[PDB]
Design a protein around this ligand. Structure first.
Ligand SMILES: *[C@@H]1O[C@H](CO)[C@@H](O[C@@H]2O[C@H](CO)[C@@H](O)[C@H](O)[C@H]2NC(C)=O)[C@H](O)[C@H]1NC(C)=O
Ligand SMILES: *[C@@H]1O[C@H](CO)[C@@H](O[C@@H]2O[C@H](CO)[C@@H](O)[C@H](O)[C@H]2NC(C)=O)[C@H](O)[C@H]1NC(C)=O
Ligand code: NAG
Ligand code: NAG
Ligand code: NAG
Ligand code: NAG
Ligand code: NAG
Ligand code: NAG
Ligand code: NAG
Ligand code: NAG
Ligand code: NAG
Ligand code: NAG
Ligand code: NAG
Ligand code: NAG
Lengths: 330, 380, 273, 49, 49
């Protein structure tokens, strides 16, 4: 809000600000667009599916163990253990729930609106995607979902990279054990290094930091007698104090303009990243990708999505060869 | 108002943010500290051993709380002509020094002590500087300063070489060397004494009644203030958006009791955002807390103006139990108050919604409000 | 005894009356640099039952405030004289504290120097300094007066083990003489212990004097604990009286949860800092 | 500074500082956009590789 | 660097600029971020083996 931030509830400040014209109707038409864009990003990313699927009450997939990714009913939030670990790892400062003091004085004309999709329906979208990709393969991304047993789907996923089905149908047990070990170890791998969740952390940090300095500029002389508008009003006469008032108001206006300009570029970069994420989910998850290094490292088999505060986390299950032998060819 | 905030006669389906509301203050508080160290003026005024006019009795006045509102009833004030400076407004001026003096004069010599004046009392006894900026107060003293035989307690000088400089005294018991003959103390012919008696009689009425008189000097210049006004305080209120002036700390907001602990010398605390949070001494001494009070934004939900005219109002970030369902005049920023503000109130994580009723059904989102809540124009 | 020692890390005071809770606020103000040189200054006037003039109390300047530390018996260094010239036009401040009240009269004097050290001032047997005060000897020219209440009341712990070191900081920016001080008797016999302690404001008054000249006048009517040797060239010599200096620097200060300064760091001492 | 006295020298230096700050801000503002475009090109090159 | 550019080797100009708040702490972080991004760009394109 202009009038609150720039002017400390002073009639003279508001009257002088009115002379500058439309430097505020211009400074609100941008942030509203940014907010609408941010709201549209998540809806475009997660809500690829039309109907909400439900996992079967039983759980048995021929040796594959999905307990670490499927929702766990015990906890009230209906979030998977990996999702819970991700939520605990990220430290969030301000969420904007009637906060009215790390984040309490930002109500100096600045407000934080809440997201449209609460971080509970996102869990339902993720669960629907997981159920669809577990019990129906990739056929639910085109028409109606069609059921098919998991071993057959894995056999065709091998067939998709030039390996015949007999390999899977003869090494099912070893493959299942390897997948279980890997999915078990991923949690400890996440827990070990703190920098793994770097990028999301920065998204939480920078904006907050920016907000901080946007308040710190309020107490700046800017070349005036003092940073307190009422003090300069009372101590010095009206007829020439408008010079100091103009100095203060132009300084604060420039400070606000800089913040808006930075926000625009940051939003553009975030949009680019979100579009890349949407493409990655549309290709790797709802199908099998023949592109190299796009979906994991090595030959690609499957992907699994998970939600995180202001972000998404992909688990790529890939196929990599092992020890080799020489041979003579013709 | 929505039509006004964007220049058009038509508005389409959607949600628009028109303006913001802020609770206005109701009361003002000026919490100055205690007022001790009063200034001595009754001590100067209350005495029965005043001096004579030729040798008047002086007084020095320094750092002291002066209140020129206690002498008015203590004396009759037959004459109350002070200097040209506003006699009524005397409690709003600060000076560095107050040098004063007092004496007694006659009925015909009331105004003789004025800048640029001449005469026996104004030339060889005491003259006043032209730029003198001091007040004069006189009052009759014939009731007390009068003896049936003779009140031979005061005198006056009449003979001196020249006219005295301002702010000077010429007390000396010499003998005037009248004429060319050198009278060396004989006090004979061609020789006189420059001092005469100033006794008082009961019969002396109009024209000879002694008037006890006091004047005090002002010196207003560029220097730190020493003698100032009372700086009266006011009372305190709690849980009410009010202004305050704690020791020259302008600000506004709701006020409550303060927690935490302050060092004895510290007065007002701060925070990471470089703002004031708690202050001291509203009355006597304690710790008290200031907080900005409720303000927020308003959003108008409406379908196309060519379809209907009903609207809904979303107040952002305000508690439905504390929202202005009253939206009274003066105290509330939004001028418009003809709205119902009743029988339809809903609490949402984004704010308070008035103008729509919750439904247990579930459809697609038409006009997104937020936090999973969406509004739409439907037929009952 | 003129000698130099390392200032270690001490001489930090509250620069403002605000209150902060667990922040890392930075300030730019006059301070005492960390690990600087502090000069002892000693008066040695006692020997047997004979005078043996000491020619002590040398000249000492005053450059934009000063930091002073002591380990007095109770009031041995009660005399303080601050003035431009101490002779005339100086209006030198005469502040004295002898466990009851202080005098803050501002007047010109030629000096108050009349020690009149009694030949029976030997501390071991006769310390008869009862009502021995020829202070503010005559005067030069003044019309100003001012009084206050006592400042340094060393809380004796009934023992010499608690050798208290009193610390004071003096500066006169745009008037308003400030006497930030701390009474910490935590010492036991080690000079300048390592640790942190803050200073609290007491008084302020505009005088307008260009305070250039700094000196003291001891209580010579009871003298002892004055050693001496050939100390020179950056050594240590006992003085019971230290002098430092101040300059405008920039510091970063850490406020405790309750609101007491706990740590501070210089911004020009070392690249790491 | 040499030709003038501090009072109006303050005004002149204020004008100079605000002008130079305005001229300086544009440089980094343009650099940010150019860097974003270069990063897009680099991402395309990485995908092509 | 601000001080070298806006107020070349003049203490009074730097003191006057100090009243303008954090308009230089912000102007260095952007350029350092650009430099780090440039360093990472050539690494991610080539260091694939
Ligand atoms: C693999 O599946 C089995 C069951 O099909 C899981 O066994 C139990 O899982 C719960 C889940 O929290 C654990 O608390 C129990 O300790 C497990 N049982 C035993 C004997 O340890 C198993 O956890 C799954 N694998 C992984 C890695 O979770
Ligand atoms: C079989 O393959 C291995 C590699 O897996 C070959 O080993 C290398 O052969 C080259 C040929 O000049 C040598 O320079 C390397 O030193 C060999 N590796 C090591 C570790 O020594 C091997 O030559 C191939 N052929 C046979 C017959 O073993
Ligand atoms: C701790 C320290 O630096 N002490 C020095 C000392 O070494 C030097 O001899 C003297 C001469 O200026 O100055 C002081
Ligand atoms: C007029 C005055 O100041 N008198 C005090 C006296 O009461 C006190 O005992 C003495 C020692 O401190 O110092 C002096
Ligand atoms: C003009 C003036 O003030 N001159 C002074 C004099 O008053 C003073 O008596 C003397 C020292 O005794 O020093 C000189
Ligand atoms: C001084 O005050 C007392 C009581 O207030 C009064 O009795 C007395 O008459 C006063 N003095 C004179 C000279 O009137
Ligand atoms: C200040 O005035 C109030 C008035 O009631 C009273 O508490 C006392 O006389 C004075 N001192 C303090 C500490 O309040
Ligand atoms: C507006 O509503 C009217 C009905 O009152 C309808 O006839 C008209 O077509 C509508 N126009 C638009 C642009 O919605
Ligand atoms: C908000 O209103 C609810 C409803 O009673 C109440 O329980 C809660 O304490 C209120 N909170 C605030 C901060 O006003
Ligand atoms: C609507 O749902 C609530 C719980 O969400 C329930 O308490 C209520 O009985 C339902 N029916 C209504 C409000 O008519
Ligand atoms: C030392 O001074 C005292 C003081 O009067 C004197 O009596 C004594 O004789 C002096 N010492 C000598 C050796 O003269
Ligand atoms: C302490 O005082 C006397 C002087 O009167 C001194 O000669 C002697 O050493 C001591 N005498 C006593 C009785 O303590
Ligand atoms: C300030 O110091 C100078 C010496 O540098 C001295 O001559 C002068 O008297 C001092 N100012 C005042 C007002 O005493
Ligand atoms: C700070 O306050 C807490 C509780 O108010 C107390 O336990 C702690 O001792 C205090 N710290 C001090 C006095 O240094």
């Amino acid at each position: 809000d202009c009038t609150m931030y720039i002017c400390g509830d002073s009639t003279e400040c508001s009257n002088l600000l009115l002379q500058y014209g439309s430097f505020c109707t211009q400074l609100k038409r941008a942030l509203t667009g940014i907010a609408v864009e941010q709201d549209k990003n998540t809806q475009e990313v997660f809500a690829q599916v039309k109907q909400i699927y439900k996992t079967p009450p039983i759980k048995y997939f021929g040796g594959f163990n999905f307990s670490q990714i499927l929702p766990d009913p015990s906890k009230p939030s209906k979030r998977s253990p990996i999702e819970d670990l991700l939520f605990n790892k990220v430290t969030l400062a301000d969420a904007g729930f009637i906060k009215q003091l790390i984040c309490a004085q930002k109500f100096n004309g600045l407000t934080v609106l809440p997201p449209l999709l609460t971080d509970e329906m996102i869990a339902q979208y993720t669960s629907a995607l997981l159920a669809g990709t577990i019990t129906s393969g990739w056929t639910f991304g085109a028409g109606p979902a069609l059921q098919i047993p998991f071993p057959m789907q894995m056999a065709y996923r091998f067939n998709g990279i030039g390996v015949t089905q007999n390999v899977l149908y003869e090494n099912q047990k070893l493959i299942a054990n390897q997948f279980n070990s890997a999915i078990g170890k991923i949690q400890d791998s996440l827990s070990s290094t703190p920098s793994a969740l770097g990028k999301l952390q920065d998204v939480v940090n920078h904006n907050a930091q920016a907000l901080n300095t946007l308040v710190k500029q309020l107490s700046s002389k800017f070349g005036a007698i003092s940073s307190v508008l009422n003090d300069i009003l009372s101590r010095l006469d009206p007829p020439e104090a408008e010079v100091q008032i103009d100095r203060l108001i132009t300084g604060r206006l420039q400070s606000l303009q800089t913040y808006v300009t930075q926000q625009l570029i940051r939003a553009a970069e975030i949009r680019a990243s979100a579009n890349l994420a949407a493409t990655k989910m549309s290709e790797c998850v709802l199908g099998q990708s023949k592109r190299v290094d796009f979906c994991g490292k090595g030959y690609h088999l499957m992907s699994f999505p998970q939600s995180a505060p202001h972000g998404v986390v992909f688990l790529h299950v890939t196929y990599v060869p092992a020890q080799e032998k020489n041979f003579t060819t013709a | 108002e929505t039509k006004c905030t964007l220049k058009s006669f038509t508005v389409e389906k959607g949600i628009y943010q028109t303006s913001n509301f802020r609770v206005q203050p109701t009361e003002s508080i000026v919490r100055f500290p205690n007022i001790t160290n009063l200034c001595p003026f009754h001590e100067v005024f209350n005495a029965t051993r005043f001096a004579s006019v030729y040798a008047w009795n002086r007084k020095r006045i320094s750092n002291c709380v002066a209140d020129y509102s206690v002498l008015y009833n203590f004396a009759p004030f037959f004459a109350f002509k002070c200097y040209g400076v506003s006699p009524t407004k005397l409690n709003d001026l600060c000076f560095t020094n107050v040098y004063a003096d007092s004496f007694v004069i006659r009925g015909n010599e009331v105004s003789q002590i004025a800048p640029g004046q001449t005469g026996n009392i104004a030339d060889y006894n005491y003259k006043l500087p032209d730029d003198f900026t001091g007040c004069v107060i006189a009052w009759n003293s014939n009731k007390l300063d009068s003896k049936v035989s003779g009140n031979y307690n005061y005198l006056y000088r009449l003979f001196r070489k020249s006219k005295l400089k301002p702010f000077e005294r010429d007390i000396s018991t010499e003998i005037y060397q009248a004429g060319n003959k050198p009278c060396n103390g004989v006090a004979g012919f061609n020789c006189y004494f420059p001092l005469q008696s100033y006794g008082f009689r009961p019969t002396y009425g109009v024209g000879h009644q002694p008037y006890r008189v006091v004047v005090l000097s002002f010196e207003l210049l560029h220097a730190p203030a020493t003698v100032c006004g009372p700086k009266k305080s006011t009372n305190l209120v709690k849980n009410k958006c009010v202004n305050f002036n704690f020791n020259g700390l302008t600000g506004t907001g709701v006020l409550t009791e303060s927690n935490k602990k302050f060092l004895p010398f510290q007065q007002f605390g701060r925070d990471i955002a470089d703002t004031t949070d708690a202050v001291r001494d509203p009355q006597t001494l304690e710790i008290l807390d200031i907080t900005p009070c409720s303000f927020g934004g308003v959003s108008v939900i409406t379908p196309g103006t060519n379809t209907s005219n009903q609207v809904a109002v979303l107040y952002q970030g305000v508690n439905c139990t504390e929202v202005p369902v009253a939206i009274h005049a003066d105290q509330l920023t939004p001028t418009w108050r003809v709205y119902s503000t009743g029988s339809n109130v809903f609490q949402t994580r984004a704010g308070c919604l008035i103008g729509a009723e919750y439904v247990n059904n579930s459809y697609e989102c038409d006009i997104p409000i937020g936090a999973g809540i969406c509004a739409s124009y439907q037929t009952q | 005894t003129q000698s130099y020692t390392n200032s270690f890390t001490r001489g930090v005071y509250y620069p403002d009356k605000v209150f902060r809770s667990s922040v890392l606020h930075s300030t730019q103000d006059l301070f005492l640099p960390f690990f600087s040189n502090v000069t002892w200054f000693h008066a040695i006037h006692v020997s047997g039952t004979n005078g043996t003039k000491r020619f002590d109390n040398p000249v000492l300047p005053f450059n934009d405030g000063v930091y002073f530390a002591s380990t007095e018996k109770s009031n041995i260094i009660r005399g303080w004289i601050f003035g431009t010239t101490l002779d005339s036009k100086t209006q030198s401040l005469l502040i004295v504290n002898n466990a009851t009240n202080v005098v803050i009269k501002v007047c010109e004097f030629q000096f108050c120097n009349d020690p009149f050290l009694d030949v029976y001032y030997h501390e071991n047997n006769k310390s008869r300094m009862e009502s021995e005060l020829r202070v503010y000897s005559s005067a030069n020219n003044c019309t100003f007066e001012y009084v206050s209440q006592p400042f340094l009341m060393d809380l004796e712990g009934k023992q010499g083990n608690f050798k208290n070191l009193r610390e004071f900081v003096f500066k006169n920016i745009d008037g308003y003489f400030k006497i930030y001080s701390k009474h910490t008797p935590v010492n036991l016999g080690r000079d300048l212990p390592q640790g942190f302690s803050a200073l609290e404001p007491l008084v302020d008054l505009p005088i307008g004097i260009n305070i250039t000249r700094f000196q003291t006048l001891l209580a010579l009517h009871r003298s002892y604990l004055t050693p001496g040797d050939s100390s020179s060239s950056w050594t240590a010599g006992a003085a019971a009286y230290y002098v430092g200096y101040l300059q405008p620097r920039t510091f970063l200060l850490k406020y405790n949860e309750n609101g007491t300064i706990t740590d501070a760091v210089d911004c020009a001492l070392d690249p790491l800092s």
